[PDB]
Design a protein around this ligand. Sequence first.
Ligand SMILES: Cc1ncc(COP(=O)(O)O)c(/C=N/N[C@@](C)(Cc2ccc(O)c(O)c2)C(=O)O)c1O
Ligand SMILES: Cc1ncc(COP(=O)(O)O)c(/C=N/N[C@@](C)(Cc2ccc(O)c(O)c2)C(=O)O)c1O
Lengths: 466, 466
Amino acid sequence: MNASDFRRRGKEMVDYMADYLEGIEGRQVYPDVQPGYLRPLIPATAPQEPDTFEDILQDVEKIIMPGVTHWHSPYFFAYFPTASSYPAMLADMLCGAIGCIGFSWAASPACTELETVMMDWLGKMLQLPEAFLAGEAGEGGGVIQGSASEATLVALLAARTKVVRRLQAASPGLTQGAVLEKLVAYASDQAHSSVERAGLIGGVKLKAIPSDGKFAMRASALQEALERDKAAGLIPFFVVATLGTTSCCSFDNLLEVGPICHEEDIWLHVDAAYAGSAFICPEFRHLLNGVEFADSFNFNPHKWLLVNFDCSAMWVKRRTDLTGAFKSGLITDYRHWQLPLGRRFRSLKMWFVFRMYGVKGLQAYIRKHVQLSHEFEAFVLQDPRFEVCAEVTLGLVCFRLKGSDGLNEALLERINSARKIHLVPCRLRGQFVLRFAICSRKVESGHVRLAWEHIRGLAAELLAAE
Amino acid sequence: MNASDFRRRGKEMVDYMADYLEGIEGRQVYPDVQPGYLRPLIPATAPQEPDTFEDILQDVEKIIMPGVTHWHSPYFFAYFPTASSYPAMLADMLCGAIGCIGFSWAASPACTELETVMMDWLGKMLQLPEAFLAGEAGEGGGVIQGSASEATLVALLAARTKVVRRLQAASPGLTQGAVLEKLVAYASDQAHSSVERAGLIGGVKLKAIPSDGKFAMRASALQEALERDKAAGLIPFFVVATLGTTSCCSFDNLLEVGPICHEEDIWLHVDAAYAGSAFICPEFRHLLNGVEFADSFNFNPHKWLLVNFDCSAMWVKRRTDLTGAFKSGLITDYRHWQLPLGRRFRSLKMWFVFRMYGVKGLQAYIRKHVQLSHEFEAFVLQDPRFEVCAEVTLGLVCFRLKGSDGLNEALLERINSARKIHLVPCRLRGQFVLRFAICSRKVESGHVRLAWEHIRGLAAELLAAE
Ligand SMILES: Cc1ncc(COP(=O)(O)O)c(/C=N/N[C@@](C)(Cc2ccc(O)c(O)c2)C(=O)O)c1O
Ligand SMILES: Cc1ncc(COP(=O)(O)O)c(/C=N/N[C@@](C)(Cc2ccc(O)c(O)c2)C(=O)O)c1O
């Protein structure tokens, strides 16, 4: 294919993309295909000779689309949002055309330089402490990671190297392996499974801190764990505090946990994968208070800030703490800030989104989602057959039918079966709970109301049947 | 920005992209900007209100482009190729529009299913042993990794878990940490630095095996290392064999190393990042002989098979050996095959590239690059002031002016300073060598001839001046 054919097909593809997202309400959110559906529908071998673009697009529609779960449908209320915005898509187009691999500064100066500035822009939007900004002369700075899962692992490895060096300074005989046996990392019992993965890869013990009645990590529970573990001769080296847990979008208490990590010289990583986007709005920024105690802070623009995956945003206060694991002001060498060596020009996506929405546009997006969340909450609160199971702060409502877990499992099954909307459950303290997450860029009140009416109607049939 | 504006700007962007790649010969390959050039040219803060798309595109041209190294210029002869093809760009567009995160089967069946099939397609094109194919009932299979650097780490972690379990089976009291102290990994002295990073992250010793006169790892040198290390009480657990080293595109001898790894129960990972694309051509497939002994095999379509970054292709014989690190036939759960949990629909890029080029088109691309490589070799061989420093097999020629390293350092400086072409050096056994790598999709004979005439003319001035 040459530039001239690309001019034609590229424009066709633009129309296909826009048609897909514009017409997405008409698609069934969750597929009816069984596991294994695809292989028998396409050839066992790559073609010797080219297929036409037309044949491929037909296959997209007839073979791929039936096996797609439509994340961007208004009726997708599962997990947390993933980002989809046209500015991000435009940037990704340009990103691919430039097509540099920014494993060094010389491989494309702008690929590195734009990223540092975008991380400063975003740092300032979040009102991060200045310690996290690169600027002209900062020791800190930010980096795009592929994902929060990777960010957490990066932070864990930096923390591991750091505590190892601290110990080996005092006892030069000590091997990495002897240190590893003693190390212990902590996270909330509501922490994302990415934390456990990081612990497994990092070769360290990971212990869960019991959350309080609001599913938050607190000083007292951390302190208790630390005392027990220190007395057994273990060395706490890393804590992940989660702002916006997956289960119920609860918030670890950084103001309590931060001082403890400072006094014990424990690396404090803040995972705000979802919730972090909200901190660009002043009315939510209080939830990030205490981040000044963190060694590293991460959230995903690719969840809730309209920057298409992959784009996870991580900042550190001390670049040498980070870069030491992998060996001020201007960053030339992002390869020491992340697991891979290669990277693409992902910062274009941030620049386009930030410039095309503006801060105000992004704030309006967040606030609309939170309003819709509360609109759904209001429905649930006014129905005495249901209960809300946790405080609603952002775009997630946890709710259930009053009654047994079985009733709620049956309700979920009926919702899934009806194929109008897609939701997933969680367990909160052994209890089965339905999650309603505001996801789509295009969700409106009307969608939420119809989702609720749909849920309420199924619940009514279920309750009569009992 | 809504669908309607995207239809307009998306098409503008398509034209911008095509203009960039079509006109790319007119760009200076390597930029003149100094580190830190960008920050003063753009604002310190995100805008409150939207900027226009026009202003953004102006900035791309006037501020970004001066800091871009043009990987896709015909006159870029640095490193190894990175992939740029219009079919891959079309797929990436669609990938972003669908916008699923394929962290589970239910998150989008096709996102997982298409990938397994494309890895089988690619496996068949490379004539991999059947042990590596998923098919209907295979224990093995393939996965897209973000990069070869990540693939190598994934393999190392799987290898680490496997040997750890073996050692704990004999000695159940042994901690992960006590095992780590004993473990030793090996790679060629020409192995890519990704291997050392994998060893560092994985917490294990990495030792270099001395390469032979053709910069190849051989049985005798491996065996000697193993015997020495075993007698010191170390436990070999992982070997990376490199097909297509960065320095001089040399090839480790898999037929020799494979049996040794089998007999010693050492995990054998094959890194064919660059060279692996050539193995779809029968005349190069012999270089992969012995891969039947490998536990894992990896190469980058995002180097030399026209699948834009990110797309690294990894296969294993035994999915449970891989899966066990992160805890037949149909794969539903790629999250146990890679470090991140999240992933996008990257397999679209493979499908589009393979379908729009066909196997024959891909073969023709590889063969044309290899012919151009030999054309450059032929120029060097006819000029008695120069020498070729290693066997030319694929798209890389190592060459130097006969004389001192300093003369060749000066020649490189003159080339870089003239800003017509971009090349990088290496050291081969302490000797300074220039590398000429065929990179751009659009390189032709004429570009290679002009590059050589340019190089020869600089050398002439340098030699007269001495
Ligand atoms: C609190 C918390 N911490 C870390 C992570 C890992 O983030 P990742 O590695 O994916 O960037 C998650 C992840 N959320 N996982 C979802 C909500 C699925 C999901 C949805 C949208 C996405 O854009 C996405 O990447 C993943 C889940 O259901 O687990 C997290 O919530
Ligand atoms: C033998 C060998 N093994 C592993 C890797 C890691 O590959 P990655 O992690 O990037 O996928 C490389 C990498 N090569 N690096 C280049 C040639 C630069 C380069 C050029 C084009 C790219 O598409 C790319 O990703 C990287 C170098 O000069 O180091 C490798 O050569």
